[PDB]
From a paper:
FIPV is responsible for the deadly systemic immune-mediated granulomatous disease, which has a mortality rate of nearly 100% in cats. Within the genus α-CoV, feline infectious peritonitis virus (FIPV) is in the α-CoV 1A species, which also contains a few other closely related viruses, such as transmissible gastroenteritis virus (TGEV), porcine respiratory coronavirus (PRCV), and canine coronavirus (CCV). The SADS-CoV nsp1 and FIPV nsp1 structures were refined to 2.1- and 1.8-Å resolutions, respectively. Their space groups are P212121 and C121, respectively. Each asymmetric unit of SADS-CoV nsp1 and the FIPV nap1 structures contained two and four subunits, respectively. With the exception of the regions encompassing amino acids 105 to 110 of SADS-CoV nsp1 and 106 to 110 of FIPV nsp1, all the residues of both nsp1 proteins can be built using the final models. Therefore, we could judge the characteristics of the same subtype and different subtypes of α-CoV by structural comparison. This comparison showed that the overall structure of FIPV nsp1 is conserved relative to that of TGEV nsp1 (with an RMSD of 0.53 Å), but it has several differences compared with PEDV nsp1 (with an RMSD of 1.87 Å). The overall structure of FIPV nsp1 and TGEV nsp1 is highly conserved, which shows that the differential amino acids (Asn2, Cys35, Asp71, Ser91, and Phe102) in TGEV nsp1 and FIPV nsp1 will not affect the stability of their overall structure. From the surface electrostatics, the structure of FIPV nsp1 was more similar to that of TGEV nsp1 and the structure of SADS-CoV nsp1 was more similar to that of PEDV nsp1. Compared with other α-CoV nsp1s, the ability of FIPV nsp1 to inhibit IFN-β and ISRE reporter genes was greatly decreased.
Similar to β-CoV nsp1, α-CoV nsp1 has been identified as an important virulence factor that acts by inhibiting the host protein synthesis function. Here, we are the first to report a 1.8-Å full-length crystal structure for FIPV nsp1 and a 2.1-Å full-length crystal structure of SADS-CoV nsp1. The crystal structures of SADS-CoV nsp1 and FIPV nsp1 reveal that their monomers contain six antiparallel β-strands and two α-helices. The overall structure of α-CoVs nsp1 shared the same fold, with a characteristic six-stranded β-barrel formed by β1 relative to β6, β2 relative to β5, and β3 relative to β4.
Residue numbers in the entry:
A (entry chain B), B (entry chain A), C (entry chain D), D (entry chain C): 2 to 105
Write the structure that this text describes.
């Protein structure tokens, strides 16, 4: 029903990340659910000002919900109180942490 | 390293809940990690207004962190940006949801 | 399915209103859906400051949702972005307005 | 006095939408009030970040007021506390919901 992943958590580094059309992010979420999140970092919602992006009308991976989190494409302006953070393509340093995630 | 639990999520009902000395909540967390959370509900932090308690100076079970969550005694006024919600003893209804938790 | 109602809208007057247990507000919602809202006023969420009650752990009628609104018991601290306002027992002045409502 | 409509509600998808001179939106509101809102979506005000347009000095259909809502041309910058959302021409999916609307 869900899967555990190790993901690098970025709470310190300003990053400029790629965004993609909705259907592309759906596909990349499915890829990462199968293969893991190497090449991505998790930015907690409370550090969202670390994330810059050139096409903010396009999407990044969102992590949403209570408990085991759902993954779905979101804008960086996503205002839901259930937003945990974003999983974005970046090569900065951080702290590897354990997540438990499912596809929305 | 962690354990999955099904916990009733309460986002609708006001609950008056017991708080306890810090050391007692530590023991209650261990018991619940072993035996499950029947009779408790998870109240997300954005609905902290739902939760009231007798002893402002005593603690409830806090759910903290990014990813798989840590369990630790917290005050109901805990301001940490890492606070996900509370697990409190209450008899109200809710929605059963999956959690992945570890002892802090 | 839903019903249209004329309801006095209060955007100006401070009101002290009764709050009730959840089950009681459910019954009051059903009564008002059958018989109308005379004796109540609608306070829009943007003037929620106008409403006070002596039991802040008890409920009033909430008006929520997009389009035809749902009616359900809420606390005066209800933070949902879907909250339109409250329907509360009060005898103040206001502007009579047309609503379209259904029971949640 | 008013009419009920089924309208696709969009809370998920970024939409680049046409904006028009004020007088043209007046006429489009009249047409849609007669013929329905097929091809349009309702974006709630709390997801106004989803909507972009080319001419930010030109207008879209605004949904305003307490209760049965008024339809009136607005800018996407519309600051009124009575703004419920926008009805905009867009291709995306959504959730069909019932509305009760009148022309301002």
């Amino acid at each position: 029903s869900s899967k555990q992943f190790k993901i690098l958590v970025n709470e310190d580094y300003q990053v400029n990340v790629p965004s993609l059309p909705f259907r592309d992010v759906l596909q990349d979420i499915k890829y990462c659910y199968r293969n893991g999140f190497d090449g991505y970092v998790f930015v907690p919602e409370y550090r969202r000002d670390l994330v810059d992006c050139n096409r903010k009308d396009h999407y990044v991976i969102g992590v949403l919900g209570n408990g085991i989190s759902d993954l779905k494409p979101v804008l960086l302006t996503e205002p839901s109180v259930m937003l945990q953070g974003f999983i974005v393509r970046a090569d900065c340093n951080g702290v590897l942490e354990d997540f438990d995630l499912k596809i929305a």
